Amino acid sequence: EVLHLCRSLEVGTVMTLFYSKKSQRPERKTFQVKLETRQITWSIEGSIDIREIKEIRPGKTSRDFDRYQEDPAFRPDQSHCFVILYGMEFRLKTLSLQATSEDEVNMWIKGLTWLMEDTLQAATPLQIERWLRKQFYSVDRISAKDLKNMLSQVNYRVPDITYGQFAQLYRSLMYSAQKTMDLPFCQVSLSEFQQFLLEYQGELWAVDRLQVQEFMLSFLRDIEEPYFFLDELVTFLFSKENSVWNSQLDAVCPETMNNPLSHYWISSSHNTYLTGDQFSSESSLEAYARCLRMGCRCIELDCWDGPDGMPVIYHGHTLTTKIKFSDVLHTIKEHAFVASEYPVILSIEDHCSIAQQRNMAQHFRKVLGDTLLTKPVDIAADGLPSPNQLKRKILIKHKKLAEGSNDISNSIKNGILYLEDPVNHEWYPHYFVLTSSKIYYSEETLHSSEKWFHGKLGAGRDGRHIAERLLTEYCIETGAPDGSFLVRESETFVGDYTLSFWRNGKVQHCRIHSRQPKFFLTDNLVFDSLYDLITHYQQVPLRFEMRLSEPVPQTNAHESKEWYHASLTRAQAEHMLMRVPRDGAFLVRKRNEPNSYAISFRAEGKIKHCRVQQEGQTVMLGNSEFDSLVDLISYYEKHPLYRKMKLRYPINEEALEKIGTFKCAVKALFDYKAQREDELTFTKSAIIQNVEKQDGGWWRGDYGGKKQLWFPSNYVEEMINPAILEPEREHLDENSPLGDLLRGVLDVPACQIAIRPEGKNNRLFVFSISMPSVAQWSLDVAADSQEELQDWVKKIREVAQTKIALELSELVVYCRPVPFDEEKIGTERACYRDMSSFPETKAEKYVNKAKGKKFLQYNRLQLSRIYPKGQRLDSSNYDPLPMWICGSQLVALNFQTPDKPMQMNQALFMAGGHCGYVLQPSTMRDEAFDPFDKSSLRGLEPCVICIEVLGARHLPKNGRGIVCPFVEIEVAGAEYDSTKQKTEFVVDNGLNPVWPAKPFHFQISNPEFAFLRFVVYEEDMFSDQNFLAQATFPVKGLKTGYRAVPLKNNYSEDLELASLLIKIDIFPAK
Ligand SMILES: [Ca+2]
Ligand code: NA
């Protein structure tokens, strides 16, 4: 049926790919489903893993298609286009496709929709097989060296081949690698597995022998009576079918959706339109689609006047992009109820004029129609309606008319300006924020190329011995074929070259003549280049006769790179690097031992050293293997080496001399008597002022009463500009408008400002900040436009000397914002329709031991909305548990951020499959309950959990090496139920590690507000702990016995095959 259709998508459809890259023109390609692996591939140029697909959207609504909405280059059609949104992160990737006919689109939509659901729900062995298929096709047949490299890429350290052999090899390895696990229980019969389910797992259904039979067959899929091989039993222990999570809880229980809305935790998003940070990230319709599909129910719109009478949405007074209110409203309409039938609240932060408010209200009614909530559910009620009563409804939260009528918001100027790096002298962007008192700025925001050409090795018998060594070393160690070769400059015949190749265990040298152009071996053909000559003899033999084969790679290319030092001690490296005022300064130095190097680098004002060993044709950094030092360093110029630090500044003598234009002073190194009338006369140590710097050997400056006269530049030393140095991060406002992004603070009244008319350093619009009381202190700042330069200067200079539309108010039925009045709580004055909102800092004043009970009482009748403080420009999140435990319902989090709070959010709303409403337990909505008084629980049964971490499979990599994994186990809830514990780490294994015996015990007094959290970290070579994977569960949904913990990434998306196996017992039993 649909199966026949899916087989047809294997053939190949030609469709136009609208690339996400704003430069790549739309190209046409042949798209095929690969059912073997459950992928989509196109001409192979690209690949989508179907398990990563989140939405298959008929039509032309994507950024890729939007690039051509006006442009006639291409005309996306509603009818001939669809979008595949897929990925592991909040920001999904998109594959936007235009087909030649409506029937093709419908085919792909229909087929992929089914492959999406089938791939996600597939039995684990099928997932494993598809994983192996994908691994194999990554490398018919493969070599064993390929195999060692392939296993290293999947986090396994290995201390002809066909796929079948590979499959069996993987199978044996996973089982043998974890034999040692304490499993008190070559074939397992349907009766043995049945007893296991009943005796260890507490699976009561299993007493029905036939269900056990069907259970095993649902897992195997491949029949007489079912059984498991031992390796298959262990595979099952790790599988999702054996998950610690009771999937029953995934379904909504209508009976728990009948309390008033104030009794529910409600999945809530802060500034939903944003995809990244609060200052410059892109606003996107996709963020609304993403949040609503994650189960979010309360989303936020920041409305500002748009250009044509309709509001746009962006973060006011920042560089975040704008999107149209109309487009947002249609996105909401399309996605609000895909994941849940339950009501959506629109929190409107309205900055619009009355006229554009009026258009909003009109558009709300036109677009949403009956979906919009315009009347109260029950004018006689004494409390908010239930989620069940508001199904399929959208509520407007907006400030409402009475009848008949220090962050970047409180900021003078915000923007991106460029500062000049004092080490590499490039311009980099930084966030700048001017307040009424200060500037805050943030942290940064032909043959030569060939492998066989080794250049000049030596100048006598030197070069020949070196060439022989390199070639012998290579051939023996790698078992290289005869004809493996390299080329060098001839030591004997100037201008000529010498070829060395392997033959019968021995090296052969052949002179390559160079003449003018003609290159030729003796008595052989002539060629126009040395490249052509070698390219020729790699295809046909030279005269024995030997065809050239494998090029010997250069292992010593580092010797000429600027960061390499062949002779340099540890202390000498530290002295050089402590002179560089930026982290990321680095160098490589050879050590006294053979085959030993050290990377020395500056991080956090301190120098650190890590060793690198040469091992054959490769280098080792920890367990991370690279082809050479040059490749190692190149990798860590593009990927962090230490914490978040990349290798940035190669440090040698020249770099240190250049570490370094407004009223600059220089010190004279020697006397100079003016040789000409326009030249300056001075003595050694004279300070020359107002210097005008210029290449050519001559600068201009003032001294001895003479103004702007010339002098040799090599006669002076530049006085340091203290502004290049790093501000003292020790003492440095922790809650500036930039939050943790802060780098520097300027006391504006103590500064002067001036525009440089000439610009500077290939920037046109530049001003200089100075401080009259700190000579030589100056900061050159570039802006992107003269207009921005002008606005910045006058605002800085000035600091240094110093109605609601009824049509819209009508739509606010519930969620009516009023000022919080503590004294109305619990009185007849409290109104169930009125609500208040709390920045996270004000909220902490009510969710503490003193006021928390009073806040619970408030929240039983009325909604409160919590949102992050303004200083979280990075879009970090606050801990939501202290708010939830005082009954707060709308605890708004930045959904784009993969931090722990959002992992707790998606964990909490697992109860009900992310419908977005979780009924608060009865014990909390009781008069006695107090989140900071364990005694308020009365006679609630507590919970004791005993856990042992036995092993893991398919742990994700973190960079190039092999993870050394350890697992942290946390219970999260009230303060009195919260604690953490952790295993030891395992050495060099993420694919199938097992852990020592370490029984953990957790005790939970309030199991109704409690989460069990597993975080897998690595212990890296610097002894830092780096996140690898994660799984957080509500305690109520936990099963017992030997259970799998399926792992997720930091965005709470499922990782392929990654899981722990634990022994988990819960008391009292139930
Ligand atoms: Ca807002
Ligand atoms: Na167009």
Numbering used by the authors: 21 to 63, 69 to 164, 170 to 189, 207 to 232, 247 to 283, 288 to 470, 484 to 523, 544 to 614, ...
What text does the study give?
The 13 phospholipase C (PLC) isozymes expressed in humans preferentially hydrolyze the membrane phospholipid phosphatidylinositol 4,5-bisphosphate (PIP2) to generate the second messengers diacylglycerol and inositol 1,4,5-trisphosphate (IP3). The two PLC-γ isozymes, PLC-γ1 and PLC-γ2, are unique among the PLCs in that they are directly activated by tyrosine phosphorylation. PLC-γ1 and PLC-γ2 are phosphorylated on equivalent sites, Tyr783 and Tyr759, respectively, and this phosphorylation is typically required to stimulate phospholipase activity.
The 2.5 Å crystal structure of essentially full-length rat PLC-γ1 readily explains the autoinhibition of the PLC-γ isozymes. In addition, an internal loop of 25 residues connecting the cSH2 and SH3 domains was removed and replaced with a flexible linker; we refer to this internal deletion as Δ25. The crystallized construct therefore contains residues 21–765 and 791–1215 of PLC-γ1. However, in the case of PLC-γ1, the hydrophobic ridge interacts with portions of the sPH domain in the regulatory array; this arrangement is expected to effectively block membrane engagement. The active site sits beneath the hydrophobic ridge and is readily located by the bound Ca2+ cofactor. A second interface is formed between loops of the cSH2 domain and the C2 domain of the catalytic core. In this case, the BG and EF loops of the cSH2 domain clasp prominent turns of the C2 domain—almost as if the loops are pinching the C2 domain. The two interfaces between the regulatory array and catalytic core do not overlap, but the sPH and cSH2 domains within the regulatory array brace each other through the C-terminal portion of the SH3 domain that lies between them: picture an arch with the tail end of the SH3 domain acting as the keystone.
